[PDB]
Amino acid sequence: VYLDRKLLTLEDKELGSGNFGTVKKGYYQMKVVKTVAVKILKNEANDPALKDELLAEANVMQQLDNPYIVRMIGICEAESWMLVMEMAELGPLNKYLQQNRHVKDKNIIELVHQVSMGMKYLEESNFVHRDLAARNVLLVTQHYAKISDFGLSKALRADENYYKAQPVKWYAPECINYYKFSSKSDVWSFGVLMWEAFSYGQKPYRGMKGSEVTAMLEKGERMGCPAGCPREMYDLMNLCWTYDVENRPGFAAVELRLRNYYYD
Numbered sequence: 001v002y003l004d005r006k007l008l009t010l011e012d013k014e015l016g017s018g019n020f021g022t023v024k025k026g027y028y029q030m031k032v033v034k035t036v037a038v039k040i041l042k043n044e045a046n047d048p049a050l051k052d053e054l055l056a057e058a059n060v061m062q063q064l065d066n067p068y069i070v071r072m073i074g075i076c077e078a079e080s081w082m083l084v085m086e087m088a089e090l091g092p093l094n095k096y097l098q099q100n101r102h103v104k105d106k107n108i109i110e111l112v113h114q115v116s117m118g119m120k121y122l123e124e125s126n127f128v129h130r131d132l133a134a135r136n137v138l139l140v141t142q143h144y145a146k147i148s149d150f151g152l153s154k155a156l157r158a159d160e161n162y163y164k165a166q167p168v169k170w171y172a173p174e175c176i177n178y179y180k181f182s183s184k185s186d187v188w189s190f191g192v193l194m195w196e197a198f199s200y201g202q203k204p205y206r207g208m209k210g211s212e213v214t215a216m217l218e219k220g221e222r223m224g225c226p227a228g229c230p231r232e233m234y235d236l237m238n239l240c241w242t243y244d245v246e247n248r249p250g251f252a253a254v255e256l257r258l259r260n261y262y263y264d
Protein backbone atom coordinates (compact mmCIF):
# COMPACT_ATOMS: atom_id res chain seq x y z
CA VAL A 1 0.00 0.00 0.00
CA TYR A 2 2.59 2.64 1.22
CA LEU A 3 5.93 3.24 -0.64
CA ASP A 4 9.33 4.54 0.67
CA ARG A 5 10.07 8.07 -0.74
CA LYS A 6 13.85 7.17 -0.56
CA LEU A 7 13.24 4.34 -3.16
CA LEU A 8 11.36 6.75 -5.57
CA THR A 9 13.22 9.02 -8.05
CA LEU A 10 11.10 11.79 -9.69
CA GLU A 11 12.33 13.68 -12.80
CA ASP A 12 11.94 17.50 -12.36
CA LYS A 13 10.23 18.11 -15.78
CA GLU A 14 6.48 17.22 -15.45
CA LEU A 15 4.73 14.97 -18.03
CA GLY A 16 1.73 17.33 -17.56
CA SER A 17 -0.84 18.68 -15.03
CA GLY A 18 -4.56 18.66 -14.05
CA ASN A 19 -6.78 20.23 -11.32
CA PHE A 20 -5.49 17.44 -8.93
CA GLY A 21 -1.83 18.55 -9.44
CA THR A 22 1.04 17.21 -11.61
CA VAL A 23 1.99 13.95 -13.40
CA LYS A 24 5.74 13.21 -13.05
CA LYS A 25 7.87 10.41 -14.58
CA GLY A 26 10.32 8.49 -12.40
CA TYR A 27 11.37 5.03 -11.23
CA TYR A 28 10.69 2.97 -8.08
CA GLN A 29 13.16 0.39 -6.64
CA MET A 30 10.84 -2.58 -5.72
CA LYS A 31 15.99 -6.35 -7.69
CA VAL A 32 14.99 -4.12 -10.73
CA VAL A 33 13.52 -0.59 -10.82
CA LYS A 34 10.05 -0.05 -12.34
CA THR A 35 9.46 3.08 -14.48
CA VAL A 36 6.51 4.96 -12.91
CA ALA A 37 4.02 7.75 -13.63
CA VAL A 38 3.16 9.70 -10.43
CA LYS A 39 0.13 11.93 -9.71
CA ILE A 40 1.38 14.45 -7.09
CA LEU A 41 -1.46 16.30 -5.25
CA LYS A 42 -0.80 20.08 -5.41
CA ASN A 43 -0.32 22.07 -2.12
CA GLU A 44 0.80 19.09 0.11
CA ALA A 45 -2.60 17.36 -0.61
CA ASN A 46 -4.48 20.03 1.47
CA ASP A 47 -7.89 19.52 -0.30
CA PRO A 48 -9.88 16.55 1.13
CA ALA A 49 -11.83 16.11 -2.19
CA LEU A 50 -8.46 15.64 -4.04
CA LYS A 51 -7.34 13.13 -1.33
CA ASP A 52 -10.68 11.24 -1.84
CA GLU A 53 -10.33 11.55 -5.67
CA LEU A 54 -6.76 10.07 -5.35
CA LEU A 55 -8.00 7.43 -2.79
CA ALA A 56 -11.07 6.71 -5.01
CA GLU A 57 -8.74 6.18 -8.04
CA ALA A 58 -6.20 4.35 -5.78
CA ASN A 59 -8.99 2.13 -4.29
CA VAL A 60 -10.55 1.41 -7.76
CA MET A 61 -7.11 0.63 -9.40
CA GLN A 62 -6.24 -1.64 -6.39
CA GLN A 63 -9.48 -3.68 -6.98
CA LEU A 64 -8.93 -3.89 -10.82
CA ASP A 65 -6.52 -6.43 -12.40
CA ASN A 66 -6.59 -6.47 -16.24
CA PRO A 67 -3.95 -6.03 -18.99
CA TYR A 68 -5.83 -2.98 -20.51
CA ILE A 69 -6.17 -1.06 -17.18
CA VAL A 70 -3.28 0.97 -15.62
CA ARG A 71 -1.87 -0.79 -12.51
CA MET A 72 -1.17 1.13 -9.24
CA ILE A 73 2.22 0.45 -7.47
CA GLY A 74 1.11 2.22 -4.25
CA ILE A 75 0.80 5.61 -2.45
CA CYS A 76 3.87 7.62 -1.27
CA GLU A 77 3.30 10.24 1.52
CA ALA A 78 6.24 12.74 1.33
CA GLU A 79 6.47 16.44 0.15
CA SER A 80 2.87 15.73 -1.10
CA TRP A 81 0.55 12.69 -1.53
CA MET A 82 1.72 10.73 -4.62
CA LEU A 83 -0.29 8.06 -6.52
CA VAL A 84 2.45 5.85 -8.09
CA MET A 85 1.43 3.82 -11.17
CA GLU A 86 3.13 1.77 -13.92
CA MET A 87 4.37 4.22 -16.61
CA ALA A 88 2.41 4.32 -19.91
CA GLU A 89 5.61 5.26 -21.82
CA LEU A 90 3.98 6.97 -24.92
CA GLY A 91 1.34 9.01 -22.98
CA PRO A 92 -2.32 9.92 -23.68
CA LEU A 93 -3.95 8.69 -26.94
CA ASN A 94 -5.33 12.16 -28.05
CA LYS A 95 -1.85 13.83 -27.73
CA TYR A 96 -0.01 10.89 -29.45
CA LEU A 97 -2.38 10.83 -32.50
CA GLN A 98 -2.28 14.71 -32.67
CA GLN A 99 1.56 14.40 -33.05
CA ASN A 100 1.52 11.15 -35.15
CA ARG A 101 -0.98 11.79 -38.02
CA HIS A 102 0.81 8.87 -39.87
CA VAL A 103 -0.60 6.09 -37.58
CA LYS A 104 -2.69 3.72 -39.82
CA ASP A 105 -6.49 3.08 -39.55
CA LYS A 106 -5.61 -0.62 -38.76
CA ASN A 107 -3.40 0.52 -35.79
CA ILE A 108 -6.25 2.74 -34.42
CA ILE A 109 -8.70 -0.27 -34.63
CA GLU A 110 -6.18 -2.42 -32.64
CA LEU A 111 -5.97 0.26 -29.84
CA VAL A 112 -9.76 1.00 -29.61
CA HIS A 113 -10.35 -2.82 -29.51
CA GLN A 114 -7.90 -3.02 -26.53
CA VAL A 115 -9.95 -0.22 -24.82
CA SER A 116 -13.17 -2.25 -25.52
CA MET A 117 -11.57 -5.33 -23.78
CA GLY A 118 -10.64 -3.20 -20.70
CA MET A 119 -14.20 -1.74 -20.68
CA LYS A 120 -15.75 -5.26 -21.07
CA TYR A 121 -13.79 -6.27 -17.89
CA LEU A 122 -14.89 -3.02 -16.14
CA GLU A 123 -18.59 -3.83 -17.02
CA GLU A 124 -18.12 -7.49 -15.82
CA SER A 125 -16.65 -6.10 -12.50
CA ASN A 126 -19.71 -3.70 -12.18
CA PHE A 127 -17.52 -0.54 -12.30
CA VAL A 128 -18.59 2.58 -14.28
CA HIS A 129 -15.63 4.73 -15.49
CA ARG A 130 -17.64 8.00 -15.98
CA ASP A 131 -14.61 9.77 -17.68
CA LEU A 132 -13.92 7.52 -20.72
CA ALA A 133 -12.19 9.77 -23.34
CA ALA A 134 -9.05 9.62 -25.58
CA ARG A 135 -7.14 11.74 -22.95
CA ASN A 136 -7.72 8.87 -20.42
CA VAL A 137 -6.39 6.09 -22.73
CA LEU A 138 -2.60 5.79 -22.32
CA LEU A 139 -0.16 4.07 -24.71
CA VAL A 140 2.45 1.61 -23.27
CA THR A 141 3.62 0.98 -26.88
CA GLN A 142 2.31 2.13 -30.31
CA HIS A 143 0.25 -1.17 -30.19
CA TYR A 144 -0.72 -1.41 -26.43
CA ALA A 145 -3.40 0.88 -24.92
CA LYS A 146 -4.51 0.99 -21.23
CA ILE A 147 -7.48 2.82 -19.61
CA SER A 148 -6.53 5.28 -16.78
CA ASP A 149 -7.95 8.18 -14.68
CA PHE A 150 -10.50 6.37 -12.41
CA GLY A 151 -11.01 9.55 -10.28
CA LEU A 152 -14.79 9.62 -11.18
CA SER A 153 -15.21 5.78 -11.33
CA LYS A 154 -17.89 4.10 -9.14
CA ALA A 155 -18.10 0.47 -7.90
CA LEU A 156 -21.83 -0.40 -8.44
CA ARG A 157 -23.57 -2.17 -5.50
CA ALA A 158 -24.97 -5.71 -6.26
CA ASP A 159 -28.55 -4.27 -5.83
CA GLU A 160 -28.08 -1.65 -8.67
CA ASN A 161 -27.33 -1.39 -12.45
CA TYR A 162 -26.42 2.38 -12.41
CA TYR A 163 -24.83 5.11 -10.21
CA LYS A 164 -27.12 8.10 -9.46
CA ALA A 165 -24.97 11.32 -9.27
CA GLN A 166 -25.79 14.42 -7.11
CA PRO A 167 -17.31 16.28 -19.57
CA VAL A 168 -20.89 16.63 -21.07
CA LYS A 169 -19.49 16.11 -24.63
CA TRP A 170 -18.68 12.45 -23.58
CA TYR A 171 -21.98 11.90 -21.62
CA ALA A 172 -25.03 9.92 -22.85
CA PRO A 173 -28.42 11.74 -22.76
CA GLU A 174 -29.59 9.85 -19.59
CA CYS A 175 -26.46 11.16 -17.73
CA ILE A 176 -27.46 14.79 -18.64
CA ASN A 177 -31.25 14.36 -18.11
CA TYR A 178 -31.46 11.79 -15.23
CA TYR A 179 -27.88 11.80 -13.70
CA LYS A 180 -27.74 7.97 -14.29
CA PHE A 181 -24.29 6.47 -15.04
CA SER A 182 -24.18 2.81 -16.19
CA SER A 183 -21.81 0.65 -18.29
CA LYS A 184 -24.22 1.70 -21.14
CA SER A 185 -23.37 5.42 -20.56
CA ASP A 186 -19.64 4.37 -20.74
CA VAL A 187 -20.50 2.73 -24.14
CA TRP A 188 -21.75 6.17 -25.34
CA SER A 189 -18.45 7.77 -24.12
CA PHE A 190 -16.59 4.94 -25.97
CA GLY A 191 -18.42 6.14 -29.16
CA VAL A 192 -16.98 9.68 -28.65
CA LEU A 193 -13.53 8.09 -27.81
CA MET A 194 -13.65 6.22 -31.19
CA TRP A 195 -14.53 9.48 -33.03
CA GLU A 196 -11.56 11.22 -31.25
CA ALA A 197 -9.17 8.37 -32.18
CA PHE A 198 -10.16 8.33 -35.92
CA SER A 199 -10.01 12.21 -35.80
CA TYR A 200 -6.31 11.92 -34.59
CA GLY A 201 -7.12 13.53 -31.20
CA GLN A 202 -9.41 16.41 -32.36
CA LYS A 203 -11.91 17.62 -29.70
CA PRO A 204 -15.51 16.40 -30.30
CA TYR A 205 -18.34 18.98 -30.98
CA ARG A 206 -15.72 21.71 -31.82
CA GLY A 207 -16.93 25.25 -30.83
CA MET A 208 -20.23 24.04 -29.25
CA LYS A 209 -21.51 24.61 -25.66
CA GLY A 210 -22.84 21.55 -23.73
CA SER A 211 -26.49 22.78 -24.11
CA GLU A 212 -25.93 22.99 -27.94
CA VAL A 213 -24.54 19.38 -27.97
CA THR A 214 -27.68 18.21 -26.03
CA ALA A 215 -29.89 20.10 -28.59
CA MET A 216 -28.03 18.59 -31.61
CA LEU A 217 -28.25 15.02 -30.15
CA GLU A 218 -31.99 15.55 -29.32
CA LYS A 219 -32.61 16.44 -33.04
CA GLY A 220 -31.04 13.01 -33.87
CA GLU A 221 -27.86 14.62 -35.34
CA ARG A 222 -24.43 13.00 -34.79
CA MET A 223 -20.82 14.13 -35.44
CA GLY A 224 -19.77 13.35 -39.05
CA CYS A 225 -17.49 10.48 -40.17
CA PRO A 226 -13.76 11.29 -39.62
CA ALA A 227 -11.52 11.62 -42.73
CA GLY A 228 -10.20 8.10 -43.56
CA CYS A 229 -12.45 6.40 -40.92
CA PRO A 230 -13.64 2.97 -42.20
CA ARG A 231 -17.46 2.86 -42.61
CA GLU A 232 -17.72 -0.18 -40.23
CA MET A 233 -16.05 1.90 -37.42
CA TYR A 234 -18.40 4.90 -38.06
CA ASP A 235 -21.32 2.36 -37.93
CA LEU A 236 -20.05 1.22 -34.48
CA MET A 237 -19.73 4.89 -33.28
CA ASN A 238 -23.40 5.47 -34.31
CA LEU A 239 -24.41 2.20 -32.53
CA CYS A 240 -22.64 3.41 -29.31
CA TRP A 241 -24.60 6.72 -29.76
CA THR A 242 -27.98 4.92 -29.49
CA TYR A 243 -30.26 7.42 -27.66
CA ASP A 244 -32.40 4.76 -25.85
CA VAL A 245 -30.20 3.12 -23.11
CA GLU A 246 -32.11 -0.24 -23.34
CA ASN A 247 -31.29 -0.61 -27.09
CA ARG A 248 -27.64 0.68 -26.76
CA PRO A 249 -25.17 -2.28 -26.83
CA GLY A 250 -23.02 -3.20 -23.80
CA PHE A 251 -19.23 -3.71 -23.99
CA ALA A 252 -19.69 -7.49 -24.63
CA ALA A 253 -21.40 -6.59 -27.99
CA VAL A 254 -18.96 -3.68 -28.69
CA GLU A 255 -15.80 -5.78 -27.97
CA LEU A 256 -17.12 -8.65 -30.19
CA ARG A 257 -17.84 -6.25 -33.13
CA LEU A 258 -14.29 -4.69 -32.90
CA ARG A 259 -12.66 -8.18 -32.48
CA ASN A 260 -14.37 -9.63 -35.63
CA TYR A 261 -13.62 -6.53 -37.80
CA TYR A 262 -9.95 -6.26 -36.66
CA TYR A 263 -9.25 -10.05 -37.13
CA ASP A 264 -10.57 -9.97 -40.78
Ligand SMILES: NC(=O)c1cnc(N[C@@H]2CCCC[C@@H]2N)nc1Nc1cccc(-n2nccn2)c1
Nearest residue numbers: 015016017023037085086087088091135136148
Ligand atom coordinates in the same frame (compact mmCIF):
# COMPACT_ATOMS: atom_id res chain seq x y z
N1 LIG B 1 1.32 6.54 -17.09
C1 LIG B 1 0.33 6.55 -16.22
O1 LIG B 1 0.19 5.66 -15.36
C2 LIG B 1 -0.61 7.72 -16.26
C3 LIG B 1 -1.82 7.68 -15.58
N2 LIG B 1 -2.69 8.69 -15.58
C4 LIG B 1 -2.35 9.79 -16.29
N3 LIG B 1 -3.24 10.80 -16.29
C5 LIG B 1 -3.08 12.04 -17.05
C6 LIG B 1 -3.75 13.21 -16.34
C7 LIG B 1 -3.62 14.51 -17.14
C8 LIG B 1 -4.07 14.33 -18.57
C9 LIG B 1 -3.36 13.16 -19.24
C10 LIG B 1 -3.61 11.86 -18.47
N4 LIG B 1 -5.06 11.51 -18.50
N5 LIG B 1 -1.21 9.93 -17.00
C11 LIG B 1 -0.34 8.92 -17.00
N6 LIG B 1 0.81 9.04 -17.71
C12 LIG B 1 1.26 9.98 -18.64
C13 LIG B 1 2.31 9.63 -19.47
C14 LIG B 1 2.78 10.55 -20.39
C15 LIG B 1 2.23 11.82 -20.47
C16 LIG B 1 1.20 12.16 -19.62
N7 LIG B 1 0.64 13.47 -19.69
N8 LIG B 1 0.76 14.27 -20.75
C17 LIG B 1 0.10 15.37 -20.41
C18 LIG B 1 -0.39 15.22 -19.14
N9 LIG B 1 -0.04 14.02 -18.68
C19 LIG B 1 0.72 11.26 -18.70
